[PDB]
Every structure is written in C-alpha cells, then in structure tokens.
C-alpha cells in the first residue's frame, strides 16, 4: 500500500508544496512508495502557484483507510484534529513540520524532522540538498512558494537565516525573480472581495485544543484592514454560525495586513477575557488591533496557549 503524504485540513501553499515535494523526495531518496494527496482544494494563492508552474493540485481524500493506506507522512502539521479524520486508525510513519507540537502521539517510534524555521518547504528543500536529489523547476516553484507564503516574502518574524539563504537558490531553480514573483503570488491571496463571509473565515483556519476548549483560529491576508472591517456585520454572523455548527468555545479571526505587518483581531466566544490577556488589548465591538502580528504560530498560538492555561 502507498504511504500517503499530506498537509493539514484547509491546506495553504506550504502544506501543498511541502507534501508534493516530500512525496517525491521520499521516493527518490528513501525508496518509499509514496503518494502526495490533500485534505482540501487549493485556496486562491495556491491556485496561482499551481497554475504558474503547471502542476495539478494533489487529489483530495477524506479517509486514509478508504484509500487503502496503512501508513502516512504528515507535513506542515502534527496535531491530530488538524489532520485526516481517521488519523488515529493509521500509523504515522513520519512528520516534517515547523509548528508547535500537541495532540500528537504514537505507539511506536517514528521519523520526525521539525525545525522552527519559516516553512515546512524550507526543511524539505534542505533535505533534497543533503540527499543530493535534483530539484526540478516545478518542485522548486512549489517549495519556493510555500516559503514565500509562510514568511510573507521573508519579512515575517518566523523567517530564519536559513530561509533567507535558500530563497534565492529556489528562485533560480524555479526560473523566477524572487521579489517580482513573491509580490505577485502574495497579492493573489488578498482578493477577499470575491469570497463570502462564511467562506473567508474558513479559507485558512485551524483548530487548537486549549485546556479542553476547541478554539478556531482563522487568518486572511489583506492589503486593507479597513475594507474588511466594512463587512464586520456579515463576518460576525458567519463566525457565530461556525461556533454553533462546530461547537467551538471561541473563534479568533486574524485580518492580516501583509503590507504593513499588523493584524486586526475579530474574536467571539466564551473566553474573551483569555483572548484579551493573550494579546494585551481590550476588545471593542468584538475587535482590537494587534500591532506587528502576521504569524499565527509565533504571535497567536503561543500566547493563547499560555492564557488559556493560566
């Protein structure tokens, strides 16, 4: 049976790029019978990436067992609630990630390669180099895009020196001008006007279990926070519906200005006091400004984890 390689639910560019690239690396370098798949359709930014390099989106699955798989390799995630529905029924052969670890356990030893760098694609690319496996233009393009996507063109505080070193290498392999391509790709993911309120709050959203509470943290990239706030009423309605249908304790939406590097936080839930403590602010009409925030893994999750536990 093939070993399925995939990123998290609501995959982003890095999730798609890292799983596609690692599935290939695992075949060439480790002789594993892998297959890259996805848990969701590409969102707009990734659609731009796939079209630019001429790569088909990995097929979407809903059950690892239904595919006949016995083993899986996770990229860009490790928390079970962010993975395939029946993740508990298959063996986790390996994990390549750059996120915090939680709600993850195995009965047996496994392979894990985690680094606190800008993207999982960055880790995968460096693994290509260490194993002397040639990187095609298409794979370079997808990995480069994952890196650019997750670090907002190397300016996010999650950007590691090693990310800055490999970006130009990947751009060369991908046949693109790093800044020219990067800016175009990032802009492709800021067209929120084409999305309904219910769609926008689930484009890039993950669930975190904080002290027994299921907290949904969503993020959207924009070039104008004010414009998004003009739709506050409809967004709040969508959020309330999401909370009711999924049983979340709280919903935190990051409206991220990727040009100026700040996020307006729109939150609704039963633990707003914990949200305010985490962000050192006071919500007014369900929102407040979080200066300098662009990263969920570095500027939202650690803080919420701490506030919910104390």
Residue 150, contacted partner among its own copies, Mn ion, none, CB below 5-8 A by kind: Mn ion
In whole angstroms, the minimum distance from the beta carbon of 109 to its own copies comes to 4
In whole angstroms, the minimum distance from the beta carbon of 252 to Mn ion comes to 17
245 is in an annotated binding site: no
Does residue 150 touch Mn ion according to CB under 5 A? yes
CA nearest neighbour of 122 among 102, 92, 93, 145: 145
CB 183 within 8 A of CB 59: no
The structure tokens listed for 125 are: 């690319």
Residues of this chain, 70-109, that bind Mn ion according to CB under 5 A: 76
Q: How many CA atoms lie within 13 A of 32 on its CB side?
A: 19
Residues of this chain, 111-170, that bind its own copies according to CB under 8 A: 111-117, 130, 158
Per DSSP bridges, beta strands 250-257 and 71-75 are unpaired
Segments of 159-204 assigned E as strands: none
Helix (H) or strand (E) holding 268: strand 262-269
12 is in an annotated binding site: yes
150 is in an annotated binding site: yes
98 is in an annotated binding site: yes
SS3 116: coil
For the chain, the maximum distance between any two Cα atoms, rounded to a whole number of angstroms, is 56
Whole-number Å distance between alpha carbons of 303 and 117: 19
In whole angstroms, the minimum distance from the beta carbon of 123 to its own copies comes to 11
One character per residue 81-120, x = contact with its own copies (rule: CB under 8 A): -----------------xxxxxxxxxxxxxxxxxxxx---
Interacting residue ranges for its own copies, rule: CB under 8 A:
98-117, 130, 158, 297-298, 301-302, 305-306
Binding residues for Mn(2+): 8, 12, 14, 76, 98, 150
Interacting residue ranges for Mn ion, rule: CB under 5 A:
12, 14-15, 76, 119-120, 150
């Amino acid at each position: 049976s093939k070993i399925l390689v995939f990123g998290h639910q609501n995959p982003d560019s890095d999730a798609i790029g890292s799983s596609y690239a690692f599935a290939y690396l695992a075949r060439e370098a480790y002789g594993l019978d892998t297959e890259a798949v996805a848990l969701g359709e590409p969102n707009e930014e990734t659609a731009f990436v796939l079209d630019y390099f001429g790569v088909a989106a990995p097929r979407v699955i809903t059950s690892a067992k239904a595919e006949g798989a016995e083993q899986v390799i996770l990229t860009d995630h490790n928390e079970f609630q962010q993975s395939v529905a029946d993740i508990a029924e298959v063996e986790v052969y390996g994990v390549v990630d750059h996120h915090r670890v939680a709600n993850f356990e195995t009965a047996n030893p496994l392979y894990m390669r985690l680094e606190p760098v800008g993207s999982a694609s960055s880790i995968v690319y460096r693994m290509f180099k260490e194993h002397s496996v040639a990187v095609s233009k298409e794979i370079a393009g997808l990995m480069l895009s994952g890196l650019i996507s997750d670090t907002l063109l190397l300016k996010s505080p999650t950007t590691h020196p090693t990310d800055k070193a490999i970006a130009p290498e990947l751009a060369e392999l991908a046949g693109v001008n790093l800044e020219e391509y990067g800016l175009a790709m990032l802009k492709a993911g800021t067209n929120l006007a084409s999305k309904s309120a219910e769609e926008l709050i689930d484009i890039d959203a993950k669930t975190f279990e904080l002290n027994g509470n299921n907290v949904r943290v969503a993020q959207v990239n924009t070039v104008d926070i004010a414009e998004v706030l003009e739709r506050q009423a409809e967004i709040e309605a969508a959020i309330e519906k999401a909370i009711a249908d999924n049983g979340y304790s709280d919903f935190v939406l990051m409206i991220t200005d990727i040009i100026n590097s700040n996020s307006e936080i729109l939150a609704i839930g039963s633990n707003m006091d914990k949200v305010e403590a985490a962000f050192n602010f006071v919500l007014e009409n369900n929102h407040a400004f979080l200066a300098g925030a662009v990263s969920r893994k570095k500027q939202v999750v650690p803080q919420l984890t701490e506030s919910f536990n104390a």
